[PDB]
């Protein structure tokens, strides 16, 4: 079971549930926050080769694009929800350092800042740049990349 | 251990030990050949996050740059060899579809052809282009990609 | 490649995959049985001087200490498994008549009897005595020793 | 066929024809000397399982107990001779690290010393101890054991 | 030479603004809370006496006053921008307890005391200390980075 | 270049280098003493918002917990030292009237007296009370507070 | 006296590394320049982090050497600045055998323009070239010709 | 102080006192050997900037050029000796990966092989090449370099 932190490469902030709860409600926004604590730990459950569910370790809820478009448009907010469904499939690209949804868009901080402030929402967007890059690091060492597929 | 074929993307040929031996001798060349059978199956030994050994399934021998240098120059031949050491580390980049050595060069067919004939050698070359793309697929379905870090 | 029978010297029984299948599943126990047939033929693939894989001829699976640990404790069961790795390395000592694992223990009949009944399991044990002795003989002449290193 | 050096384990010296000739005369003694060169390389030609001829690589002559008797007494000198016959059968025990003649005695340094001087003769003798141990090593790396049975 | 900063209401993350967001608010314009960030809500601090100084709206140069300009304003006195400089407009920026204190000892509060005041909530003086009157002083380019307002 | 006296609020004594030396050695203790002179003048060098170095004006040495540990335990002596690093970072809380270390403990007179006698040592301690209050005053008026940040 | 203080001497010219302006507490992103002068405001220390890699520390300020901007692989011609921040993009090694200062990503500290005789106030910049003009030696505050060990 | 292994970079063997004694006699040769244990751990006592004593940890004896010339010639044997003298000053060049004596020659394997056998003597020699490269590693991890100047 590899528990990891999802670190925004450009700012050093991390993916958090909005509120930091061990049990965020369904459709709780996924934000960037500088803090580190067990309630921002994630896991990845491989489903089909590169594709799987990004799972909030404390609640078991997984990352979803808000709604059910399957092919979400740019600026679609990312949330947590207990449901498992194909539209919640992502890949964790540790070679290009990004997170790609099954329909081909990536997780971004909303607005594209290299230094997004705490509580900035995350959204889907097709663009590629240094501000949408994320790396996956050890909870006991924020500079140690860990393999999220194992 | 999950077993996969290393398929040259442009041609559909596969990486082989030279000669097709179940127990190829040390320093046997790795070549592209169209045949599929048990003796060209591969596995991947994770060592450190993305880095590991590419292992020949039938013998347990792993892929080495000829000469075993830490930082091999272009055109260093790829072979099999029993030694397991940090100079034979590669990553399987299934997002950009290539195989990269620890010192930063990639596995290429010697000469760079997108449709190399059977028995073409492989070498280390630092450039990135199409003729060096490889995908990792199921032995029982050569068109279905499989996750090698698991 | 020489094919041979692994004969328990004291009893004349032979090592078998428990059940006699031609393709035993991973982790099938190795047992002693008196019968001779093609599904108890073995081969030896040299890896590094004295060390190699003991291979079930009919299935291509090799002998492993159950659990695949590098340094298995006494009574660890011997099984057949498809993986090839350092922890499945043995030497076939045809001078002292035993089978030694890379970490220094030997193949024994479970319980150490000089006359074990059919289906007796085999286990690893560090002790040396007459009940852990094995000789390597021709499938067509169970009393003629054959060279397993060739 | 594998070419090797016969190294006295206790002293690190090697087995030589007396005088170091590329074509020793019949009945030339075999001695211990520390030097390494092509005229002290050996090969093993397997005849029957463990039994074979110890062949001087440069000349093709093989190791004999002087006189060619089937059951040589203690202190019988070892020599080279071109004749090939059963009384010249030895086995290369790479598990107990010794060389045994078919009638059951071993090759020794004359006198049984752990550190014999250069040009010390070799003789047959039934005793087993540290000073009659030999290992069989690569001509390019005198500490690397090689399998003489291939 | 004088640092520029945002005055962020700690509990809500809203900011002190001139009501209307103008870069030249008239004298006696109310100071309100609002989520927006732009250069017309930047402030500066002009030190006058150790901890005491003028809180200055960067775009207009007008400073924060208790409405009416009394030396000892009562609770609920509205805070405004005014161009005059005088010793009844002296405040200290307490970056250790996270509040803004007037020379006579009352603090800047959102009117109504909410940890979540809506946009346009007025600000007033009140003597009470609690989490709804806490403010932090942050960089215009990084709303989570506290900056030193005295230097 | 604001120079100031560090005055113990309850007693009116001041922070001195032990000995009143213009050039105190590394690890010289910081005591309380009634005297006023150029050798007990201090400065504060800002490094990060509230955080900076408390600097002995005459020597340029700064205030350290003895040993310079990140999380010094209660009763850790305060000393002078020339080296600048993160464990010698303090904030001058002129609103609550105390001196706080980066790890959260405060500078106290050893023993907690509201009237410590001359030569009382100072130490780190986590308690807040009247005897650990300090004010920062003009060298030309011990009752005139001065801004230490500007 | 506790951590080795030293001067960073440009070998070809004999000038030293200074903070532009010569301050004891230079602001963040202050450029590092070259200057003939000696004073305790150009003293440096080296804080070891991982074997050869560590932080080059302006002794008086306590701020550390960074490629301007904090990029891991600064392009050639990136000026060197002093910043209070500490992170992985400010790791350097002090090669006192080949006489250079190397960044974790492999480029060296140079005088801007590569002169063996750079003028006062010459900026320093990162760059991949190796030559007699990018060589530095690390010397004692009490003897500009005495090399001192910067790693203890 | 700090303890390390002196690893011949090209072969992975280490420096040892010949014989492996925890108290080698004065003038014992320094040799190469594959083993790792407590009586081949080294320390480095700094004397003058880069110059210091290479110290055998178990005995405290330091490395000397054999004999007494100030400026020893190529092929001068390296030995251990308890004496401290300026003729035993070396620098541990961890940037170019070599060990240089005060008079300007380097420590080499006798004969200059990239794969010297166990017991190979070490000598001074002025040449620089791959076979005289050494790295200084942790006793617990032969591949992890450690800082020897501390
Ligand atoms: O929000 C992540 C993406 O933002 C893009 O920019 C937004 C921007 O807020 C809007 O003003 C306009 O530029 O279109 C975009 C909305 O889809 C970034 O430019 C893009 O790179 C992403 O990071
Ligand atoms: O061999 C891998 C590379 O082949 C390159 O071509 C070689 C080749 O040996 C020969 O055709 C001649 O041109 O020298 C070249 C040196 O690399 C390809 O151009 C290159 O992309 C690699 O795949
Ligand atoms: O255990 C190895 C031996 O199995 C023998 O057959 C077993 C059989 O597998 C089991 O199902 C039951 O019938 O007991 C039998 C005992 O004969 C094979 O016949 C024997 O050849 C071994 O392979
Ligand atoms: O010494 C080994 C040889 O013994 C031979 O006996 C004779 C041999 O016939 C003769 O050629 C000469 O070598 O003297 C030997 C001692 O009498 C065996 O006949 C020969 O086969 C070798 O074994
Ligand atoms: O030749 C090797 C053997 O040496 C034997 O020693 C002789 C010994 O030389 C002689 O003086 C007398 O003791 O008879 C012994 C038997 O031949 C050793 O006894 C034996 O160990 C061998 O190594
Ligand atoms: O009118 C007073 C407010 O005006 C704001 O203008 C705003 C609007 O009211 C606000 O909701 C924002 O999101 O968009 C408008 C810009 O056209 C000022 O920014 C603000 O200070 C208020 O005081
Ligand atoms: O106005 C700032 C003060 O509000 C006080 O409470 C208000 C209350 O919230 C409001 O709705 C009305 O009842 O008047 C009260 C008394 O002024 C807070 O209690 C006080 O602490 C201030 O924040
Ligand atoms: O030194 C400042 C603090 O001293 C405390 O007294 C110590 C002391 O070591 C001993 O009296 C015992 O009570 O442990 C105390 C630490 O908790 C004062 O009690 C405390 O108020 C501080 O001033
Ligand atoms: O730039 C670093 C050097 O500046 C010197 O000061 C300069 C500077 O131009 C200005 O501050 C003025 O004082 O003129 C000086 C010309 O020499 C520092 O004094 C010098 O030590 C350097 O650090
Ligand atoms: O130069 C080292 C520092 O760079 C910081 O970023 C700079 C950068 O120039 C720009 O992005 C803006 O934010 O100003 C910063 C100066 O503080 C790094 O983020 C910081 O780590 C320092 O290393
Ligand atoms: O900065 C030191 C380097 O100077 C370089 O000279 C120019 C160079 O020609 C230009 O391409 C760019 O790098 O600007 C440099 C001066 O700022 C030298 O080419 C290089 O060797 C270094 O000395
Ligand atoms: O919005 C997310 C935030 O929520 C808070 O409750 C938590 O304490 C923060 O550390 C962060 O999780
Ligand atoms: O919001 C995320 C998604 O979660 C589930 O409910 C479902 O797949 C969609 O209905 C959508 O709500
Ligand atoms: O070079 C690789 C090849 O080896 C040959 O012996 C065989 O004909 C092919 O199937 C292929 O495996
Ligand atoms: O060519 C492959 C092999 O080459 C040897 O020279 C090297 O030492 C081995 O470890 C292996 O890499
Ligand atoms: O039973 C032995 C086997 O056990 C597995 O857990 C391991 O993955 C295999 O590779 C092999 O070691
Ligand atoms: O399970 C096998 C073991 O059986 C024991 O009874 C015996 O004492 C051991 O030597 C070992 O052979
Ligand atoms: O007696 C055997 C010896 O003969 C010598 O002439 C030769 O130089 C030595 O290497 C060794 O062969
Ligand atoms: O509202 C604040 C203002 O109040 C006025 O009445 C006063 O005269 C001004 O000087 C200023 O203090
Ligand atoms: O311990 C410090 C003391 O040492 C004296 O030399 C100094 O003059 C005194 O005023 C007192 O401060
Ligand atoms: O010569 C040095 C070597 O000596 C061997 O005899 C010893 O067993 C080894 O530990 C090694 O140190
Ligand atoms: O290493 C050999 C040399 O070592 C010194 O300790 C000794 O004083 C020299 O005269 C010589 O014996
Ligand atoms: O003994 C050390 C020497 O070994 C020789 O073979 C080589 O020519 C020299 O370069 C030096 O390494
Ligand atoms: Ca001094």
Distance CA F61, CA G60 (A): 10
Q: Which fold has domain F5-145?
A: Trefoil (Acidic Fibroblast Growth Factor, subunit A) (2.80.10)
* Dihedral-angle region of residue A104 (phi above 0 means left; psi in -120 to 50 means alpha; beta otherwise): left
| Residue C92, burial from CB neighbour count under 10 angstroms (0-12, 13-18, 19+) | buried
Both structure tokens of G144: 């500009």
Q: Which residues of E96-121 are buried (b: 16+ CB within 10 A; e: fewer)?
A: eebbbbbbeebbbbbbeeeeebeeeb
Q: Work out whether strand B30-33 and strand B42-48 pair parallel, antiparallel, or are unpaired.
A: unpaired
Query: What 8-state DSSP symbol labels residue A20?
Result: -
Helix-then-strand count for chain A, H and E: 0, 13
From A96's Cα to the closest Cα of chain B, the distance in A is 8
Query: What 8-state DSSP symbol labels residue A117?
Result: P
Residue ranges of E strands in A1-150: 5-8, 14-17, 28-33, 42-48, 51-56, 62-65, 78-81, 90-93, 98-101, 106-109, 120-125, 134-138, 141-145
- Rounded to the nearest 10°, the torsion over CA B48, B53, B59, B65 is -150
| Residue C33 marked ligand-binding | no
Residues with Cβ within 8 Å of C53's Cβ and at least 6 positions away in sequence, in order, are: B60, C44, C45, C47, C62, C63, C84, C88, C89, C90
Both structure tokens of G87: 């992170």
Q: Which residue is associated with the tokens 């541990």?
A: H92
Cα-based angle E32, E35, E38 (whole degrees, multiple of 5): 90
Cα-based angle D100, D106, D109 (whole degrees, multiple of 5): 135
CA–CA distances in Å: residue H3 to residues D82, H46, H80, H106: 57, 13, 17, 21
Distance CA G94, CA G8 (A): 10
Both structure tokens of G98: 């080949």
Residues with Cβ within 8 Å of A95's Cβ and at least 6 positions away in sequence, in order, are: B50, B91, B93, B94, B95, B96
Q: Work out whether strand G124-127 and strand G92-95 pair parallel, antiparallel, or are unpaired.
A: unpaired
Q: How many residues does chain E have?
A: 151
* A contact chains, 3+ CB pairs < 8 A: B, E
The protein residue with its alpha carbon nearest to ligand 5, atom 8, reads D111
Query: What 8-state DSSP symbol labels residue A57?
Result: T
The answer, yes or no, to whether any atom of ligand 16 lies below 6 A from the CB of C27, is yes
From A79's Cα to the closest Cα of chain E, the distance in A is 22
Both structure tokens of C100: 């030694």
Instruction: Name the residue facing E96 among F46, F95, F150 (closest C-beta).
Output: F95
Cα-based angle E69, E70, E76 (whole degrees, multiple of 5): 90
Instruction: Name the residue facing B46 among A46, A49, A150 (closest C-beta).
Output: A150
H55 Cα distance to chain centroid:
9
Cα-based angle E142, E147, E150 (whole degrees, multiple of 5): 150
Output the CA C146–ligand 3 centroid distance in Å: 26
The answer, yes or no, to whether any atom of ligand 4 lies below 6 A from the CB of D27, is yes
- Rounded to the nearest 10°, the torsion over CA D136, D141, D143, D146 is -40
| Residue B35 marked ligand-binding | yes
| Residue C56, burial from CB neighbour count under 10 angstroms (0-12, 13-18, 19+) | buried
Cα-based angle D123, D50, D132 (whole degrees, multiple of 5): 30
Which has the closest alpha carbon to G128: G112, G109, G113, G145?
A: G109
Which has the closest alpha carbon to D16: D80, D68, D76, D65?
A: D80
> Are residues D10 and D130 in contact, defined by beta-carbon separation less than 8 angstroms?
yes
Distance CA B107, CA B99 (A): 6
| Residue F33 marked ligand-binding | no
CB-CB under 8 Å, H115 with D12: no
Three-class DSSP category at F51: strand
Question: Which chain C residue shows the shortest CA-CA distance from D149?
Answer: C149
> Are residues E102 and E125 in contact, defined by beta-carbon separation less than 8 angstroms?
yes
Distance CA E29, CA H9 (A): 76
Both structure tokens of E83: 């161009």
Q: How many residues does chain C have?
A: 150
E11 Cα distance to chain centroid:
15
CATH of region H3-145: 2.80.10.50
> Are residues G128 and G108 in contact, defined by beta-carbon separation less than 8 angstroms?
yes
Output the CA C120–ligand 3 centroid distance in Å: 12
> Are residues A142 and A36 in contact, defined by beta-carbon separation less than 8 angstroms?
yes
Distance CA C103, CA E12 (A): 64
First and final C-alpha spacing in chain C = 6
CATH architecture of the domain E6-145 equals Trefoil (2.80)
Both structure tokens of E114: 């909410």
Tally of CB atoms within 10 A around H97:
16
CB-CB under 8 Å, G63 with F85: no
> Are residues H139 and H43 in contact, defined by beta-carbon separation less than 8 angstroms?
no
CA–CA distances in Å: residue H73 to residues A48, C122, H18, H123: 67, 63, 22, 9
CATH 3.60.10.10 for domain G7-147, yes or no, is no
> Are residues H3 and H43 in contact, defined by beta-carbon separation less than 8 angstroms?
yes
| Residue E87 marked ligand-binding | no
Instruction: Name the residue facing H95 among G98, G147, G149 (closest C-beta).
Output: G98
Tell me the H-state helices in chain F: none
Distance CA A130, CA G69 (A): 14
Which has the closest alpha carbon to E79: E137, E12, E150, E18?
A: E18
> Of the bound ligands, which one is closest to the alpha carbon of residue C18?
3
Both structure tokens of D43: 């090969």
> Are residues D120 and D101 in contact, defined by beta-carbon separation less than 8 angstroms?
no
Three-class DSSP category at G132: helix
E77 Cα distance to chain centroid:
14
Count CA atoms closer than 13 A to C65's CA, side-chain side.
28
> Are residues A106 and A128 in contact, defined by beta-carbon separation less than 8 angstroms?
yes
Which has the closest alpha carbon to F135: F94, F101, F100?
A: F94
Q: Which residues of C63-79 are buried (b: 16+ CB within 10 A; e: fewer)?
A: bbbbeeeeebeeebbbb
First and final C-alpha spacing in chain F = 8
Output the CA A123–ligand 1 centroid distance in Å: 10
- Rounded to the nearest 10°, the torsion over CA G148, G149, H1, H3 is -140
Distance CA H23, CA B99 (A): 51
Which has the closest alpha carbon to F74: F27, F128, F148?
A: F128
Tally of CB atoms within 10 A around H44:
23
H128 Cα distance to chain centroid:
16
> Are residues E62 and E25 in contact, defined by beta-carbon separation less than 8 angstroms?
yes
Distance CA H123, CA H101 (A): 11
Distance CA B137, CA B143 (A): 6
Tally of CB atoms within 10 A around H141:
10
Both structure tokens of D4: 């090797």
Three-class DSSP category at H119: coil
Distance CA D51, CA D36 (A): 26
Q: Where are the domains of chain E?
A: 6-145
Chain C residue numbers touching B24 (CB-CB < 8 A): none
* C contact chains, 3+ CB pairs < 8 A: B, D
Which has the closest alpha carbon to H95: G97, D79, E76?
A: G97
Residue ranges of E strands in B9-140: 14-17, 30-33, 42-48, 51-56, 62-65, 78-81, 90-93, 98-101, 106-109, 120-125, 134-138
């Amino acid at each position: 079971m590899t528990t990891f932190l999802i670190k925004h490469k450009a700012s050093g902030k991390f993916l958090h549930p909005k509120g930091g709860s061990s049990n965020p409600a369904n459709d709780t926004n996924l934000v960037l926050h500088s803090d580190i604590h067990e309630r921002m730990y994630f896991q990845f459950d491989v489903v089909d080769e590169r594709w799987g569910y990004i799972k909030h370790a404390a609640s078991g809820k997984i990352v979803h694009p808000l709604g059910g478009k399957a092919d979400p448009p740019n600026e679609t907010k990312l949330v947590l929800h207990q449901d498992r469904h194909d539209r919640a499939l992502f890949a964790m690209d540790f070679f290009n350092d990004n997170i790609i949804h099954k329909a081909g868009k990536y997780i971004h901080p909303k607005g594209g800042s290299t230094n997004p402030p705490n509580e900035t929402l995350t959204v889907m967007h097709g663009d590629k740049h240094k501000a949408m890059e994320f790396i996956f690091v050890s909870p006991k060492d924020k500079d140690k990349r860990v393999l999220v597929y194992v």
